[PDB]
């Protein structure tokens, strides 16, 4: 007796690691005999929620990436080019770069 | 069941074994009329197969996410690879690029 | 009792595999002496269909490439950068990608 | 409640765990997997602003790294050139034209 | 007993294979002694047909290239990056590709 | 006896080199007793000026960069590719390099 | 006695091959006492024709390059990556290419 | 004198890259450094930018001569010579440009 | 009488080879004392012509580059990737190029 969206979230969490749709479906608590078509219909209904959830899991891992990038930028034992790319990366994300393009339209 | 279930079974065989005729004969079809029916059948049902294979491509995204997270968190990986994976998840998380200034000239 | 279209499709498959205009022409089951002008005329007549066929042939190979990329992503003994590129590719084709650019016109 | 949220935000930014950073902010320790989800999706924009400010905090370090690489005589030539070009690009001196012909 | 179109076709074939202006000119069957001034006018006259012929000839080679790319994709003993690039290539030409970009115009007038 | 603008400039310069916000705050000459809260409010207030200062410092380092790029271009015992990239770069900043695109829009 | 058009073409050919303005100028036959005073202006006169001449000369080498690319693509003793790049190149020049891009415009 | 110290301060920044250091090296008041250099630099930003843009224009013949020498040097690596030749041909006014567009809509 | 239009071009040649503004100014036969400012002002006056002249000098070097590229393409002992890049460059210069792009502007305005 659980929220249908919460059992859907359990299905999503089980799908994110163990990589099988019907397996996560029955692990979400559905009919084990009416299994392989009902998981397909359920997935085809709530596709947009699944995409938003996957983007949420991507966003959950960003602080690790930030620590990695800063540590590489301040690492004295790294190659010069990799430090330069890390410093460039955080400077770009900080709001500094530029591009000047000149256009010339010779129409016919 | 419905001929559509035999078609999706045929699509499953096409997704794994890379042969039109082999996936045809695995569906339970004519072994004598082999080159004839699979070509017309495939040329008719293109959109369902394309949607099915794009769904199969999407089926592997948790694996790819786990791989990228592992490369970012693997302590013994090269500096450049850790930096590039971290840049990738930061970009997919919603932290990105920057400015461009335009200058428009026109034909005499 | 064979269709012109079917003969044409056999000629296209033979051109994709046996790599010669006159050779694939006669392998389609045609006249071997009235060939060198006739195969050229036949090719320039049905060019759009041959190109559509070749795109169908390219699409015939996408599951192999899909398996290749998934295998490269799942290989524990592969170089790090290549695994990363394979996973990036699967994430991009799955529908999660790149972002913004700001415009400012000085005219 | 926002100051306790900032406490939780720093704990999340450094220790990389939702439930642990939740209880490390001085919040309810028993019921974790449900309330942290609602709180996290609730203040998403605040967390994003928090992380973008933290990204901006490291900019002086990056600038110093790039100038050091540009001034190092024992650095490879290609890396020195890329760094000097990079600060020149960020300083406001750059590129040029592209001509179009539309039929 | 040949027309201007068939001698032009022989001229184009000789130019595609034997690579010489006077050589491809005379293999079409003209006078070899007073050649160097007239070939410039001839080529500048039928340039577009030669270009279309050359693109046709390029289109003649696609199955060889396709076979090479597929073999590289299925070759297990090839470097990982080249196998990856090849699989990416056939997927891109097959119709599975890229994605979004957001615009932000801070306008002037 | 110096402006809030001069105290802000010293705080920003200290922020350029001196990492601690609170360290750059007290080195700018403010109250050391309540610094860690007041530096947060002060920084969140004057964000645009600090960003402008950092862009000013980036421009402050450009003559060094020009000297390095021209010197690497003039180095007689340097690799060809690096000399080529530097010469290309200064030629591009001088106002050279062209690129043509023909468009065909099928709406 | 020489036709002016043929003489200009000969001067152009000398620039194309023997790499000198004054060399091709004296190779046309011109006033011996003065050349530099006029040759610079003369070159500035027929600039567009010389550009057409060099654009024709680049096209003169196209079948050789095509043979080069086909041989590199079909040579079995070449690196895998170079074989792939050559095959890709001839496939692109044959007319088979790239795909989509999504736009999202936020206003001001 | 004042102009001499103005451009010498910039060349000193080009040589050892520090504003207070180049200010005290330029030959003005050595006693007050951190405030007077800030005011002086903020005033003449356009002047230093124009000066360095002129200095860049001073070096373009060097870049051209270096590139031509790299292109015609017979014992240089092949790829570097090819990149140099491509660059000089591109700046001479010769490049490829094809592109077919197809703009759709959600209706 | 050397005209100001042609003497400027001689100064331009001196700037392209002998690499100094004031030195080329006095090497045109000017006052060596009227020095550091006068060459700067002269340069600021005729900037567009100086740029056009250096562009003619840059255009002067294209035949050598073409010779080099064809030589690299024709070298039997050159690396495969480098010969391929040379052939790609000359094919692009001949008029054979790029390919498709699909646009889709689905947004909430």
Author numbering:
A (entry chain G), G (entry chain C): 13 to 120
B (entry chain F): 14 to 121
C (entry chain E), F (entry chain I): 13 to 119
D (entry chain H): 16 to 118
E (entry chain D), I (entry chain B): 13 to 121
H (entry chain A): 15 to 121
Quote the passages of the study that discuss this structure, keeping the authors' original sentences.
TerS also stimulates the ATPase activity of TerL, while repressing the large terminase nuclease activity. Thus, three related small terminase subunits from Pseudomonas phages PaP3, NV1 and LUZ24 are polymorphic in solution but adopt a nonameric quaternary structure in the high affinity heparin-binding conformation.
An initial molecular replacement (MR) solution was gradually improved and entirely rebuilt, yielding a complete atomic model of PaP3 TerS currently refined to an Rwork/Rfree of 25.0/27.4%, at 3.0 Å resolution. PaP3 TerS folds into a hollow nonameric ring of mixed α/β structure that resembles a mushroom. The quaternary structure of TerS consists of an apical gear-like ring ∼105 Å in diameter sitting onto a 9-stranded β-barrel ∼50 Å in height, similar to that found in β-porins. Unlike P22, PaP3 TerS lacks a ‘dome-domain’ and is pronouncedly asymmetric. The RMSD between subunits varies between 1.23 Å for chains a-h, the most similar and 1.67 Å, for chains a-i, the most dissimilar. This asymmetry is generated by an uneven pattern of lateral contacts between neighboring protomers. Three pairs of contacting subunits (labeled as i:a) make a close-distance (e.g. 2.5–3.5 Å) salt bridge between R56 and D21 projecting from juxtaposed protomers. The crystal structures of PaP3 and NV1 TerSs presented in this paper revealed a solvent-filled channel of 9.7–15 Å diameter. This channel is too small to accommodate dsDNA, ruling out the viral genome threads through the central channel of TerS during packaging. We demonstrate PaP3 TerS binds DNA through a highly dynamic N-terminal helix-turn-helix (HTH)-motif that adopts a different conformation in solution versus in crystal. Mutations in the HTH helix α1 (DM-TerS) reduced binding to cos by over 70%, confirming this region of the protein is responsible for DNA-binding activity in vitro.
